[PDB]
Design a protein around this ligand. Structure first.
Ligand SMILES: COc1cc2c(cc1OS(N)(=O)=O)CC[C@@H]1[C@@H]2CC[C@]2(C)[C@@H](O)CC[C@@H]12
Ligand SMILES: [Zn+2]
Ligand SMILES: [Zn+2]
Length: 257
């Protein structure tokens, strides 16, 4: 099974999933000088007040927070998107040290970690059908930089020690995802893929310009998780990110000047 180690890492993924060498792979470096403004882009509309969190779990690749996506309760629309996209879950990527951690980069600069809020296109009826469509998913990427503590992240990090090993889960109710967003909704956007196997190129990427701030104490909690299952030799869950892929002619657009 794939992972982030030397023998099952990103350099190996292409063998089981050839698309790893596709034309629209993610993540990528965002060069502020070549990412131009696109007027056809509409205002980004994030509607999370109706969000119903269900649980939080460790799948061995990171930890996910899932939401009830049976109704158009927590949705994403506007921007470069068509119709509605329902939030289904969010997770993070981080490094072995504060200097690295994010997947995307801004003018070659990495942040301490990165947040991925995953949504699927409701026109495909179901998540399963969505991931297999070029425009099936919309992922809202948000950078995390070390500084002040993010009040809204407290609940998440406080539970981690209860799901240290791969396979552990726990009920996670009443979490409001709005507490993880920065002040500004300014963003960059491009067509790409999942940053992990099966690496399908079904993602419209929306990366926020403004990073949210999290304390050193908070990020360190992430590094307490384990890739491995209970009872197995500990393999700390750090550096669960994928190297940047070639842009290969795709255009990164910005919602601002
Ligand atoms: C939530 O966003 C992801 C979903 C999936 C993967 C990685 C993901 O992370 S990311 N960094 O945002 O690209 C890899 C496994 C992906 C799953 C999408 C749905 C799939 C295709 C299921 O149908 C089976 C395996 C699943
Ligand atoms: Zn897996
Ligand atoms: Zn991700």
């Amino acid at each position: 099974h794939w992972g982030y180690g030397k023998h099952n890492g990103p350099e190996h993924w292409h063998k089981d999933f050839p698309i790893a060498k596709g034309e629209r792979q993610s993540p990528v470096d965002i060069d502020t000088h070549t990412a131009k403004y696109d007027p056809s882009l509409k205002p980004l509309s994030v509607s999370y007040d109706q969000a119903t969190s269900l649980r939080i779990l460790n799948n061995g690749h990171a930890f996910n927070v899932e939401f009830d996506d049976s109704q158009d309760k927590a949705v994403l629309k506007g921007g470069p998107l068509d119709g509605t996209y329902r939030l289904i879950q969010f997770h993070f990527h981080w490094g072995s040290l504060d200097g690295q951690g994010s997947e995307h980069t801004v003018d070659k600069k990495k942040y301490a970690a990165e947040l991925h809020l995953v949504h699927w296109n409701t026109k495909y009826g179901d998540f399963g059908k969505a991931v297999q469509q070029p425009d099936g998913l919309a992922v809202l990427g948000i950078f995390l930089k070390v500084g002040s503590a993010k009040p809204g992240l407290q609940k998440v990090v406080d539970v981690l020690d209860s799901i240290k090993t791969k396979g552990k889960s726990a009920d996670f109710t009443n979490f409001d995802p709005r507490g993880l967003l920065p002040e500004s909704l300014d963003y960059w956007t491009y067509p790409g893929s999942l940053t992990t196997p099966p690496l399908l190129e079904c993602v419209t990427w929306i990366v926020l310009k403004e990073p949210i701030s999290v304390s050193s104490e908070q990020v360190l909690k992430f590094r307490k998780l384990n890739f491995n299952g209970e009872g197995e030799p500990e393999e700390l869950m750090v550096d669960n990110w994928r190297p940047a892929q070639p842009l290969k002619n795709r255009q990164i657009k910005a919602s601002f000047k």
